[PDB]
Design a protein around this ligand. Structure first.
Ligand code: CDL
Ligand code: PC1
Ligand code: PEE
Ligand code: PEE
Ligand code: PEE
Ligand code: LPP
Ligand code: HEC
Ligand code: CUA
Ligand code: MG
Lengths: 47, 92, 145, 92, 131, 61, 90, 49, 60, 48, 100, 80, 100, 186
């Protein structure tokens, strides 16, 4: 509904429509893949 | 001489599942075919426009002559081909 | 027939013993006809007792639309809708036409499969005896052993 | 190349194909050795009366079990749709 | 022919054809804010809509490109001149959902918020009847 | 924000849940507004609450 | 070759790979035809793919379905857990 | 071979967010069904100022 | 060489797999936004400098 | 101007290895006895 | 009465019985501008045949409002009253086939 | 390219011009000229216009004449 | 003398591309069942009926379309004040006599 | 890849071969001034670009991307109801454009749209079937999928029959709850 202080709200917050829920879950679905892509690559940044 | 032509079952797309007919507010089951009529009419829109055009052309004629059976039989054959592909899935 | 005609505006209800195979389309023609009643096309006007049907030759049939939802109650509980009754009476009339349909198809299955094995035996035989002929070498000024 | 003309000739790949005569190779001999260990020739085929008895007795037993197999095949494909598979409930 | 202009039978028999009502929604100024109002998001006329109903929003822009954004409803449609974009929505819970214009539209791009309040269908009908 | 309040309760029940909004100020003017008040709003808010109580009793009927 | 290490293509199919320039052209053409076919044979075909009574049910679907069917979990899972909005206040 | 350690470390850290997402969906399904935070016949129109 | 070639293949096709894993989700969510729904009410929204005009059907 | 060709319905018995669905045939007898029989006859169909 | 009666007769009927739903001819696109212009042209042609007072033409205007924003309609309705609306020029005074 | 021979098989020289005596017929000369300068340019140059003209003029029968007897709902006269 | 492109590249890719475009379009029409018969006229049925009446002599020749509608805009009211179809027909008749 | 100029390079026949590439590689080259040097530079380029295994991966990607691109362009022109190249319909008012309206419904129902819409229940927790029913008939009635979308949807169970709350979150149970309160029709 309205922004609240010091909230991460990663991927969205307070959906009030089925489409709004879809948007939040699409981001949540891809987020672990993004973490994998980052962690897997960064771990090899070294001599 | 015989009712049907035989085919491989892979060529005969028999319904793999059964969806029961919807029930009306009264509680009487609604005919699956009647529910499928609007959807199949949309799939045959091109022929329906031809038929609707004929109706308006015969409406203008000031004599009493004019029919649109020819175009209705093409629309009906189309709507029915659509029904055949999905009707037995709602029938036991 | 006269009595039947006099009860159906002169039209004769045909015997349904072989009707499942007496029309082009076969069983499909029964299913289509019973579910093929429609409002008359524009410009077509039908007298009392004449109804429009897309699959009857001509479009106008003296048969009142026979299937109405809830007309009967199936003993097994199947929902009684016009399209179900059509699918079921078409099935029954197809059976009535040729009650030996299942025996014909079970014995046909055993014959067709056996015939395939038979084809393979006569083929190996044909290939064998004709090898004698198709690999011979006739020489005139040459000799190779 | 030259397909469809008076200059038509076998392509190189058809000619390479015919250059592989497989002389001396026998990759299916294992099957014949194994079949010969059944001693069908020494026991049945060699003698004409016994060859006749193999065709008769083997056709009696083969016909029966072939029928048996395809009867079971049919009983399975049409499960639930056969008269024997659906006992009738008399109306009350 | 009259039948080339399809109309429901009820209206042909004298039923009143519906009218439409338009209202303007403006930001509440800093000096006009009340003790509890949210700064930069409050408006003087909110848009009331019924919940648990399929609503079609047709969005366009008269002069420049604005953008109608309601984050809680998952809507962000550009109000472009010449395009009447259709957006379908189905609100599931009551509340007040605040949004802001999402396309730089001039000096006061930051001062045209979007406030939508979703109420029960019975409440919406009473509101619409009175306002 | 009813779904933020529900999800906070669910998370807190399961495990350790920490919100910055709970511990820290949300505005930077907090250093100067220790004793600041709007007395005009206080009187208006109290009056509206009193009227609301009367309306509630009437609604109860 | 699709999803194929071309080192393998070079080793196992030496004669097909002899002309590497021609091999590259086929790589482009094959994947061009695949992309073109996807649009006009998987996406475009009109009034198709709406047979929801024919949802594929894989061997794993049935393994897990029968397991739950054997126990009461399938019945319990399908049961509607709540069909009222408000609880009754004592 | 070491790069595999990174794959496994990135698969563990990713799975943590999968579990959070999994629990999130369970919670969402219970909001409109059981959560007292969900209120109906509650919000009343404010009206024009 | 053999090991290096396999790594280079993975450097290219592991991302390709991930993209393919997103492709199906992307199609579905796009189809969902553009779904013909049986809407029963229309609200017209016009954006002007600097305010939002709303046109709504009035109850009869 | 031949009569519209009937559509190709997917009856069970149309496949090579398929039978007549007895449950449907039984219901079909009921439909024939209670609807079609009023006007039509099946002279060559016997109860046996 | 027939289930497919809406599609029969015209494609126009579909939105006439369901005013707030997608028109079959424009449902593929989110932009509904062309939909508004067709609906206005249909209101213009109704009045020419039936007059402004006819309930049919009044409803054809309600249908036009369902898809056309008011600021566009007011402008286009003034052009129509003057006699400069290009969607209402009588066909024998059109110039579309002239000089090309 | 692929090296090929000169395809001109006509007369390489008519002789010295002597008041236009002992020279081929005009049409023969035109044909020899195009043979000498190449028919590929003729076909290439005229191809575009031939195509456009054939398509436009073909409408005289395909779009106009045929159409007059194409509309199946026109042959029927009203009050007949 | 070494060649980079097809020996007949310009004609090949020009006419060739046109051919592929035309053939692909026919295939697309068949798959969607689009009517392929060209109509050069407007489809306003009431208007086409008025035009037949003019061709049949029921409506006098050169009668404007705004002289036949049931609603007139302001500019067409201006024109109706100076419209004299009878005089126009007589003038055309005089021209024919002079020409012959 | 041979290292001696005496050993010839195999070439197929056609428009993209080793011989075809040799003819055109040095057309604009100032460095291929004699046969020996020209062949050395030609084989150097061929060795570097065509005998490089990873280079073939990019060839696949360009083909796939370009094929999709050409087809999406063609599809718009050939089928999209809103793209006009012919003018017959553009010389008529909107109500009279029947030939163009014929593209509308077929274009509104592509195969992939019918195949993938049932899988919305992998993205929506509450009432994923809120928009399934539509009485008009422009599109097919939608039935929710029986399985999760393959890939990265580990947060939901592989099959929805496994989920305990799935049935209670359906638009049908929600409609039952709200209809029992008289709250709303849907
Ligand atoms: C009983 C009978 C009954 C009836 C039966 C009817 C049956 C049907 C009849 C119709 C015929 C059907 C035929 C089918 C099979 C055809 C097979 C065939 O031979 O085709 C190939 C034939 C020629 O192709 P080709 O064999 O490749 O050419 C051989 C060359 O000689 C190869 O040599 P080249 O390539 O070396 O050629 C020279 C080339 C050499 O060039 C080069 O070296 C390359 C240079 C490239 C770069 C150029 C640089 C830029 C240009 C600079 C110069 C500019 C100058 C102009 C400036 C203009 C400024 C305004 O130069 C050029 O070509 C280009 C330069 C010349 C100037 C270009 C001018 C501009 C062109 C672009 C615009 C074109 C459109 C103009 C429109 C109008 C104006 C707006 O093409 C056609 O015939 C066309 C297609 C035909 C089929 C489709 C027909 C459809 C309609 C049919 C309707 C018929 C009537 C039906 C009635 C039905 C009633 C029932
Ligand atoms: C109507 C409006 C337009 C009017 C203006 C038209 C402008 C174009 C006029 C072009 C005229 C060009 C004259 C060239 C000079 C000729 C000199 C001469 O006498 O030569 C003798 C010479 C004598 O031959 P020779 O001695 O040179 O022989 C050379 C050596 N051997 C024998 C080996 C070949 O012969 C010729 O006439 C050669 C030239 C013939 C050129 C013919 C060109 C025709 C151009 C018109 C095209 C019409 C197309 C119609 C549609 C076709 C459809 C497919
Ligand atoms: C040289 C001799 C004279 C030639 C004279 C030609 C004159 C006319 C030239 C006009 C431009 C070229 C196109 C001609 C098309 C003729 C057929 C035609 O009318 O096509 C119409 C048809 C659609 O018509 P409508 O019915 O109005 O729309 C319905 C709903 N979509 O349009 C077309 O097909 C033509 C327009 C597209 C042309 C190009 C083909 C489309 C794909 C382009 C792909 C681009 C990317 C790269 C491709 C690389 C190679 C694969
Ligand atoms: C031409 C030959 C046609 C043969 C034929 O009709 O085969 C019968 C039947 C196919 O009927 P469908 O209805 O398609 O079965 C679907 C799955 N239940 O096929 C078979 O029995 C299998 C094929 C023949 C096997 C023969 C084996 C012989 C050696 C042992
Ligand atoms: C190995 C790969 C193939 C594995 C098997 C795939 C398969 O069979 O999937 C079937 C399955 C359907 O099965 P059910 O839903 O259970 O039944 C249908 C009920 N109506 O299909 C799917 O899941 C969808 C597959 C879609 C593939 C899409 C390919 C790409 C298409 C174009 C994408 C967009 C391109 C760019 C834009 C183009 C615009 C025109
Ligand atoms: C950059 C590297 C690129 C490498 C190449 C990537 C190609 C990826 C192609 C994946 C295609 C999967 C979907 C297939 C269609 C489908 O399931 O689609 C499903 C639909 C409907 O199936 P159902 O109705 O039976 O459920 O299928 C059809 O209706 C017919 C589909 C015909 C497909 C022909 C065109 C594609 C041919 C692809 C050949 C190459 C495949 C390579 C696989 C690795
Ligand atoms: C049970 C549901 C049925 C079935 C399966 C059929 N009918 Fe009738 N029918 C009647 C009449 C007068 C006719 C003759 C019509 C005419 O030709 O004028 C028919 C015809 C048929 C056919 C044959 C159609 C044709 O191609 O000849 C078939 C297959 C058929 N019927 C099947 C009359 C009646 C009834 C009188 C009220 C009733 C009831 C039915 N029919 C019912 C059935
Ligand atoms: Cu308006 Cu920004
Ligand atoms: Mg923007």
């Amino acid at each position: 509904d309205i922004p609240w202080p010091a909230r991460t709200d990663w991927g969205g917050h307070d959906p009030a429509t089925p489409f709004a829920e879809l948007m939040i879950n699409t981001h949540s679905m891809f987020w672990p893949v993004a973490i994998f892509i980052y962690v897997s690559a960064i771990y090899m940044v070294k001599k | 001489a015989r009712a049907y032509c035989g085919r491989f079952a892979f060529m005969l797309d028999y319904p793999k599942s059964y969806h029961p007919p919807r029930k009306n507010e009264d509680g009487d089951y609604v005919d699956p075919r009647t529910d499928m009529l609007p959807k199949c009419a949309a799939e045959c829109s091109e022929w329906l426009t031809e038929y609707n055009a004929c109706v308006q052309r015969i409406k203008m004629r000031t004599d009493g002559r004019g029919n649109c059976q020819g175009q209705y039989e093409e629309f009906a054959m189309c709507q029915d081909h659509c029904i055949a592909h999905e009707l037995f899935h709602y029938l036991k | 027939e006269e009595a039947a005609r006099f009860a159906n505006q002169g039209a004769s209800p045909p015997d349904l013993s072989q009707q499942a195979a007496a029309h082009h389309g076969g069983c499909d023609y029964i299913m289509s006809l019973l579910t093929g009643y429609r409002d008359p096309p524009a410009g077509v006007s039908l007298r009392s007792g004449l109804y429009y049907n897309t699959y009857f030759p001509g479009g106008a049939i003296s048969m009142p639309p026979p299937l109405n939802d809830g007309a009967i109650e199936y003993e097994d509980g199947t929902p009684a809708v016009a399209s179900q009754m059509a699918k079921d009476v078409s099935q029954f009339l197809t059976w009535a036409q040729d009650p030996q349909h299942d025996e014909r198809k079970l014995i046909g299955l055993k014959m067709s499969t056996a015939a395939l094995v038979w084809l393979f035996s006569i083929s190996v035989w044909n290939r064998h005896v004709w090898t004698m002929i198709k690999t011979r070498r006739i020489d005139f000024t040459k000799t190779v052993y | 190349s030259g397909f469809g003309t008076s200059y038509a000739h076998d392509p190189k790949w058809i000619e390479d194909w015919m250059a592989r005569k497989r002389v001396g190779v026998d990759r299916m001999d294992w099957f014949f050795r194994a079949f010969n260990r059944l001693r069908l020739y020494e026991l049945f085929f060699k003698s004409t009366p016994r060859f006749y008895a193999f065709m008769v007795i083997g056709g009696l037993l083969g016909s029966y079990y072939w029928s048996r197999f395809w009867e079971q095949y049919w009983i399975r494909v049409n499960k639930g749709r056969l008269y024997k598979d659906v006992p009738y409930v008399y109306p009350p | 022919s009259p039948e080339d202009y399809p109309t429901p039978q009820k209206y042909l028999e004298g039923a009143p054809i519906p009218s439409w009502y338009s209202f303007q929604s403006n930001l509440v100024g800093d000096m006009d804010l009340k003790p509890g109002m949210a700064r930069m998001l409050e408006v003087d006329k909110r848009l009331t809509v019924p919940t648990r109903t399929h609503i079609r929003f047709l969005i366009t822009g008269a002069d420049v490109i604005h953008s109608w954004s309601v984050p809680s409803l998952g809507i962000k449609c550009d109000a472009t001149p010449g395009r009447l974009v259709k957006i379908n929505t189905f609100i599931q819970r009551e509340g007040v959902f605040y949004g802001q214009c999402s396309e730089l539209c001039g000096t006061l791009h930051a001062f045209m918020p979007i406030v939508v309040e979703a109420v029960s269908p019975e409440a919406f009908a009473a509101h619409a009847k009175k306002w | 924000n009813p779904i933020t309040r529900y999800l906070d309760r669910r998370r807190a029940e399961r495990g350790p849940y920490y919100l910055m909004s709970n511990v820290l100020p949300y505005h930077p003017h907090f250093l100067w507004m220790r004793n600041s008040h709007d007395y005009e709003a206080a009187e208006a808010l109290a009056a509206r609450r009193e009227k609301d109580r009367e309306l509630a009793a009437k609604l109860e009927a | 070759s699709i999803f194929t290490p071309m080192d393998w293509m070079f080793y196992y199919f030496p004669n097909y790979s002899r002309d590497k320039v021609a091999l590259m052209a086929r790589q482009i053409k094959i994947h061009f035809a695949i992309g073109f076919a996807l649009v006009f044979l998987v996406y475009h075909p009109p009034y198709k793919g709406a047979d929801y009574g024919n949802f594929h049910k894989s061997p794993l679907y049935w393994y897990k379905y029968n397991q739950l069917e054997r126990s009461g979990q399938l019945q319990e899972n399908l049961r509607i857990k709540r069909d009222w909005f408000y609880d009754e206040d004592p | 071979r070491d790069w595999l350690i990174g794959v496994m470390l990135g698969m563990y850290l990713g799975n943590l967010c999968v579990q959070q997402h999994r629990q999130y969906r369970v919670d969402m399904k219970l909001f409109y069904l059981e959560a007292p935070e969900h209120k109906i016949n509650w919000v009343k129109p404010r009206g024009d100022l | 060489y053999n090991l290096v070639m396999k790594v280079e293949f993975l450097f290219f096709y592991l991302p390709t797999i991930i993209v393919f894993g997103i492709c199906i989700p992307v199609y579905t969510i796009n189809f969902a936004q553009e779904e013909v729904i049986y809407t029963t009410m229309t609200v017209k929204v016009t954006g002007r400098q600097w305010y939002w005009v709303y046109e709504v059907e009035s109850p009869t | 101007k031949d009569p519209p060709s009937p559509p190709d319905w997917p009856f069970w018995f149309k496949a090579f290895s398929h039978c007549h669905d007895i449950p449907s045939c039984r219901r079909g007898y009921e439909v024939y006895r209670q609807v079609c029989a009023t006007c039509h006859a099946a002279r060559f169909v016997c109860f046996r | 009465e027939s289930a497919d009666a809406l599609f029969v007769g015209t494609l126009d009927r579909l939105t006439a019985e369901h005013p707030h739903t997608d028109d079959p001819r424009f449902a593929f696109q989110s932009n509904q501008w062309n939909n508004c212009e067709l609906r206005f042209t249909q209101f213009c042609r109704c009045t020419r045949e039936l007059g402004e007072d006819d309930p049919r033409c009044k409803y054809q205007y309600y249908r036009a409002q369902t898809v056309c924003h008011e600021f566009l309609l007011e402008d286009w309705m003034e052009h129509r009253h003057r006699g400069t609306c290009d969607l209402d020029i009588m066909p024998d005074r059109q110039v579309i086939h002239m000089r090309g | 390219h692929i090296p090929h021979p000169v395809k001109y098989v006509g007369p390489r020289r008519y002789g010295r011009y002597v008041y236009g005596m002992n020279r081929p017929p005009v049409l023969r000369q035109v044909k020899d000229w195009i043979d000498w300068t190449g028919w590929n340019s003729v076909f290439g140059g005229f191809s575009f216009q031939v195509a456009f003209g054939l398509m436009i003029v073909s409408g005289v029968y395909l779009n106009n004449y045929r159409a007059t007897h194409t509309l199946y709902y026109t042959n029927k006269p009203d009050n007949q | 003398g070494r060649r980079l492109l097809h020996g007949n590249y310009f004609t090949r890719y020009l006419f060739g591309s046109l051919a592929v475009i035309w053939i692909a379009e026919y295939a697309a029409a068949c798959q969607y069942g689009i009517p392929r018969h060209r109509n050069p006229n407007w489809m306003w049925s009431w208007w086409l009926e008025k035009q037949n009446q003019i061709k049949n002599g029921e409506i006098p020749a050169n009668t404007p379309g705004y002289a036949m509608v049931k609603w007139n805009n302001e500019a067409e009211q201006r024109w109706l004040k100076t419209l004299n179809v009878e005089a126009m027909n007589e003038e055309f008749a005089r021209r024919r006599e002079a020409y012959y | 890849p041979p290292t001696r100029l005496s050993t010839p390079l195999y070439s197929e026949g056609g428009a993209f071969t080793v011989n075809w590439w040799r003819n055109r590689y040095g057309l604009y080259s100032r460095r291929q001034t004699d046969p020996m040097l020209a062949e050395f530079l030609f084989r150097q380029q061929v060795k570097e670009w065509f005998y490089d295994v990873p280079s073939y991966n990019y060839a696949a990607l360009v083909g796939l991307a370009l094929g999709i691109l050409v087809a999406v362009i063609w599809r718009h022109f050939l089928f999209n109801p809103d793209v006009y190249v012919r003018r017959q319909e553009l010389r008529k008012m909107w109500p009279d454009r029947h030939r163009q309206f014929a593209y509308a419904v077929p274009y509104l129902n592509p195969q992939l749209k019918n195949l993938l819409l049932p899988y919305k229940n992998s993205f929506i927790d509450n009432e994923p079937d809120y928009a399934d029913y539509n009485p008009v008939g422009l599109r097919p009635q939608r039935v929710m999928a029986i399985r999760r979308i393959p890939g990265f949807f580990w947060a939901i169970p592989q099959y929805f029959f496994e989920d305990p709350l799935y049935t209670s979150c359906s638009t049908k149970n929600m409609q039952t709850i709200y209809k029992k309160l008289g709250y709303s029709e849907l």
